[PDB]
C-alpha cells in the first residue's frame, strides 16, 4: 500500500462544481475520508454534508487534511496547484486536463523544491482497494491484493485491474500518473514507492508512445528493482508526428516509438507482454 490509505484525510478544490460534486459523491460512498472542500466566494456553507471554505489554508486549519484533489478548469489550475503548496498540503491530485505546458513546467519546479507530491495532471487517479479512492474510476473491479500498477493511460488500467482480480491476485494500490508531457511525478518516482512496500509482491507497468520516462524507468529497474515486473506499451500501429488523444502521446522527430520502449524495457530484465490480453497470464509466472 502506497500514497494513501483509510487514514488519509482529503479536501477537494473546486468542490462545488459539476465534476467536483459527482466525483466526490463517489469517493464519499466508497468510504474515502473526505473532510470538506474549497471554492472562493462560497466559504461558510455545506455541500455534500461536508464544510466548504474560502481558502486552502482556512481548510487545512479547521480540518488538518493532508491531501487535496483538484477539479478546477485549466485557466486557473496553476493558481490553485500553487495556493495548495503554500498552505502546506503534502499530496496533490490534479484531474484537470488542458493545462498549458509552460504552466506545468514552472509548477513542477516548485513541486520539487518545496518537497510536495502531485499526481497528474490530466485524468490521473489513485486507489488502494477497500481502503481509499480519489479519482474517477469504478471501484468494483478491484479486489484487495498484492499487485502494484502504474500507468499513463487511465482506461488501460481498468483492463489490467480486472485481469488481476479474475486470476485471484488483487491489487495493492493503483497509480495513474496522467497523460500530459510533463507530469508531476513519473514512473521512477512511483516505482520506488512500491519496492519499499511489503503488501506489493509484483509490478505491472503500463506505458505508451511519446517521451522517454519508459526508457528511464527501465535503466532504474535493472539497477534498483528487486521485485518482478510485467510491462505493456500501447501504440505500435500509431503514426509519426500526430498526437493520439493524450497531450503527450506523440512521436516527435523519430524519438519515443512503441518498439524502442519495449526493447529497452526488455534488456532491463522485465517481462514484456505484447497483447494486453496476456497480462494476467504473464503474472502467473510469479
Amino acid at each position: 500500500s502506497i500514497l494513501i490509505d483509510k487514514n488519509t484525510k482529503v479536501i477537494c478544490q473546486g468542490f462545488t462544481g459539476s465534476q467536483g460534486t459527482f466525483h466526490s459523491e463517489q469517493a464519499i460512498a466508497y468510504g474515502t475520508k473526505m473532510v470538506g472542500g474549497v471554492t472562493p466566494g462560497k466559504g461558510g456553507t455545506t455541500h455534500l454534508g461536508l464544510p466548504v471554505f474560502n481558502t486552502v489554508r482556512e481548510a487545512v486549519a479547521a480540518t488538518g487534511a493532508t491531501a487535496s484533489v483538484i477539479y478546477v478548469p485549466a485557466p486557473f489550475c496553476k493558481d490553485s496547484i500553487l495556493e495548495a503548496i503554500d498552505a502546506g498540503i503534502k499530496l496533490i491530485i490534479t484531474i484537470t486536463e488542458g493545462i498549458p505546458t509552460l504552466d506545468m513546467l514552472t509548477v513542477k519546479v516548485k513541486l520539487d523544491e518545496a518537497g510536495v507530491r502531485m499526481i497528474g495532471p490530466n485524468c490521473p487517479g489513485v486507489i488502494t482497494p477497500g481502503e481509499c479512492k480519489i479519482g474517477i474510476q469504478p471501484g468494483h473491479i478491484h479486489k484487495p491484493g498484492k499487485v502494484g500498477i502504474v500507468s499513463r493511460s487511465g482506461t488501460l488500467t481498468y483492463e489490467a485491474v480486472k485481469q488481476t482480480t479474475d486470476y485471484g491476485f488483487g491489487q495493492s494500490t493503483c497509480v495513474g500518473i496522467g497523460g500530459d508531457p510533463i507530469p508531476g511525478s513519473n514512473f521512477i518516482d512511483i516505482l520506488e514507492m512500491f519496492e519499499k512496500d511489503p503488501q506489493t509482491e509484483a509490478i505491472v507497468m503500463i506505458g505508451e508512445i511519446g517521451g522517454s520516462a519508459e526508457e528511464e524507468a527501465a535503466a532504474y529497474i535493472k539497477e534498483h528493482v528487486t521485485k518482478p515486473v510485467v510491462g505493456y506499451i500501447a501504440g505500435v500501429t500509431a503514426p509519426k508526428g500526430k498526437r493520439m488523444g493524450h497531450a503527450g502521446a506523440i512521436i516527435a522527430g523519430g524519438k519515443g516509438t512503441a518498439d524502442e520502449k519495449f526493447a529497452a524495457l526488455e534488456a532491463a530484465g522485465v517481462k514484456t507482454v505484447r497483447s494486453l490480453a496476456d497480462i494476467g497470464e504473464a503474472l502467473k509466472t510469479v
Binding site: 485549466a74 485557466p75 488542458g98 493545462i99 498549458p100 505546458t101 509552460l102 513546467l105 514552472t106 513542477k108 519546479v109 474510476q137 469504478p138 500507468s151 499513463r152 493511460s153 487511465g154 482506461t155 488501460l156 488500467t157 481498468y158 483492463e159 480486472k162 497523460g179 508531457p181 510533463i182 503500463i206 505508451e208 508512445i209 517521451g211 522517454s212 520516462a213 500501447a234 501504440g235 505500435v236 500501429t237 500509431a238 503514426p239 500526430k242 493520439m244 488523444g245 493524450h246 497531450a247 503527450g248 502521446a249 522527430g253 523519430g254 512503441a258 505484447r274 497483447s275 494486453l276 490480453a277
Partner: protein, 385 residues
C-alpha cells in the same frame, strides 16, 4: 497548432527580428504588383503551406521578371502541393509569399522546443544550415549546441553569446545573434509556443544575420490566452474531420486500413488498434469517445469512421464509462439504423448490465456481434474480412 511562414515573419517584425521584405498574396495580380513595391529583382516566390521541404518540391523558386512571378502564382493558387512531409494528398496553396532575394554567404540553424526529458525550454544552434536537423542529430551529434532556459531568470544575454561563439562568429555578428536569441526566446514564453525553427538563419554577403524561413508551433492548450494566435489558424491545412470531430468531443485520426475502431479512452484506443494488427487486421483509424457514449455522440462517431470507403467492419469497445452498458447497446443499434450501416459491427462491453446489453444486441437482428471479451472481439472482426 501550426502557423504559416508569412505569419511567423510577421510576428518577427513585431519583436524587431530581421526578416526579408515581402508580401503575402492571394491572387496572381497581387503577387505581380508586389514586385515593384519590393524593389528591383530578383525575387523569391514561395508557396504557403504548413509543411516543409517546399524547396525540393519546386515550391520555392527565384525569379527574374514580373511575368515569371505571375506565371508561378497561376500555376499554384488553388492546387495542392506535396512535399516529403505531407501525405499523398498534399496541402492546398492559397497564398504566395513574394519577398526579396537575399545575398547568401552561409546558412545556420537556430531552433527551440520543450525537452520533456530535462523539463526545460531548449535552444539549439548549428553550423549545418539548410538541412534536416534530425539527420545532423543522429549522423553528427557533436555539431548541435544547446543551452537551457532557467525558469527563475528567463533568457540571459550570455547564453546567447555562448552559442554565438561555439558557432564561430565574431565582431558585430555576435551582438546581432544575441539580439535574435533574446528575441525568439521572449516570443517563446510570451506567445505560449511549443516549437520554433529558423532554418536557414543566414549570413548575408554584406555580413548581417537574417531569418529566411520560419516554422512556428503554438500550444493548443493555451489558445484561451493567446487570442491573436487563435485567429491565425488555417483549417484548410488539416483534415476536415479532425475538426469536425472535435466539435463533438471526439479525438479522431485517419490511418489506412479496413477495420474501424470506436473506443473510449486514448490508452484503450491505441491498445485496441494494436491487438487488431496483432491478429492480421489493419486498423483504419483511432477514435477516442470522450464524454460517455450518448445516443447522438455514438452516431456522429460512426458518421465519421464510415466516411472512409476503405472500411469493411467496425469494432466498438467500451469499458466502464459513465453510461449503463445497456443504453450504449440501445444507442449503437439506433445508430446503425439512422446512419444506414452496411458493414459488420462488433461490440464488446464490460461493466454494468453488460450481461443483458449484449443480449439486446444479439436479439436486435442487425449485423452486430456481441464478443466474449477482448481476444475474441479481435478475431471476430479480423474474421469478417
Amino acid at each position: 497548432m501550426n502557423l504559416h511562414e508569412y505569419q511567423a515573419k510577421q510576428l518577427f517584425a513585431r519583436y524587431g527580428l530581421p526578416a526579408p521584405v515581402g508580401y503575402a498574396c492571394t491572387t496572381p495580380r497581387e503577387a505581380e504588383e508586389a514586385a515593384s513595391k519590393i524593389g528591383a529583382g530578383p525575387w523569391v516566390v514561395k508557396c504557403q503551406v504548413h509543411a516543409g521541404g517546399r524547396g525540393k518540391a519546386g515550391g520555392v523558386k527565384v525569379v527574374n521578371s514580373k511575368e515569371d512571378i505571375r506565371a508561378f502564382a497561376e500555376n499554384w493558387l488553388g492546387k495542392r502541393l506535396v512535399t516529403y512531409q505531407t501525405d499523398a494528398n498534399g496541402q492546398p496553396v492559397n497564398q504566395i509569399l513574394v519577398e526579396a532575394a537575399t545575398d547568401i554567404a552561409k546558412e545556420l540553424y537556430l531552433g527551440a522546443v520543450v525537452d520533456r526529458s530535462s523539463r526545460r525550454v531548449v535552444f539549439m544552434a548549428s553550423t549545418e544550415g539548410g538541412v534536416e536537423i534530425e539527420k545532423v542529430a543522429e549522423e553528427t551529434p557533436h555539431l548541435i549546441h544547446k543551452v537551457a532556459l532557467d525558469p527563475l531568470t528567463g533568457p540571459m544575454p550570455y547564453q546567447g553569446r555562448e552559442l554565438a561563439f561555439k558557432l564561430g562568429l565574431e565582431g558585430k555578428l555576435v551582438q546581432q545573434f544575441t539580439k535574435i536569441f533574446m528575441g525568439l526566446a521572449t516570443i517563446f514564453l510570451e506567445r505560449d509556443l511549443a516549437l520554433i525553427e529558423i532554418n536557414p538563419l543566414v549570413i548575408t554577403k554584406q555580413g548581417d544575420l537574417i531569418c529566411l524561413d520560419g516554422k512556428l508551433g503554438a500550444d493548443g492548450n493555451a489558445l484561451f490566452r493567446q487570442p491573436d494566435l487563435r485567429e491565425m489558424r488555417d483549417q484548410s491545412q488539416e483534415d476536415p474531420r479532425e475538426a469536425q470531430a472535435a466539435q463533438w468531443e471526439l479525438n479522431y485520426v485517419a490511418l489506412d486500413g479496413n477495420i474501424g475502431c470506436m473506443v473510449n479512452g486514448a490508452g484503450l484506443a491505441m491498445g485496441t488498434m494494436d491487438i487488431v494488427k496483432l491478429h492480421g487486421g489493419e486498423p483504419a483509424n483511432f477514435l477516442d469517445v470522450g464524454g460517455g457514449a450518448t445516443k447522438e455522440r455514438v452516431t456522429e462517431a460512426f458518421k465519421i469512421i464510415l466516411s472512409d470507403d476503405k472500411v469493411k467492419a467496425v469494432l466498438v469497445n467500451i469499458f466502464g464509462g459513465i453510461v449503463r452498458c445497456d443504453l450504449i447497446a440501445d444507442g449503437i443499434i439506433g445508430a446503425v439504423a439512422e446512419v444506414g450501416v452496411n458493414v459488420p459491427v462488433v461490440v464488446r462491453l464490460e461493466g454494468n448490465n453488460a450481461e443483458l446489453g449484449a443480449k439486446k444486441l444479439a436479439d436486435s437482428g442487425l449485423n452486430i456481434i456481441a464478443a466474449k471479451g477482448l481476444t475474441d472481439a479481435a478475431q471476430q472482426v479480423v474474421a469478417a474480412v
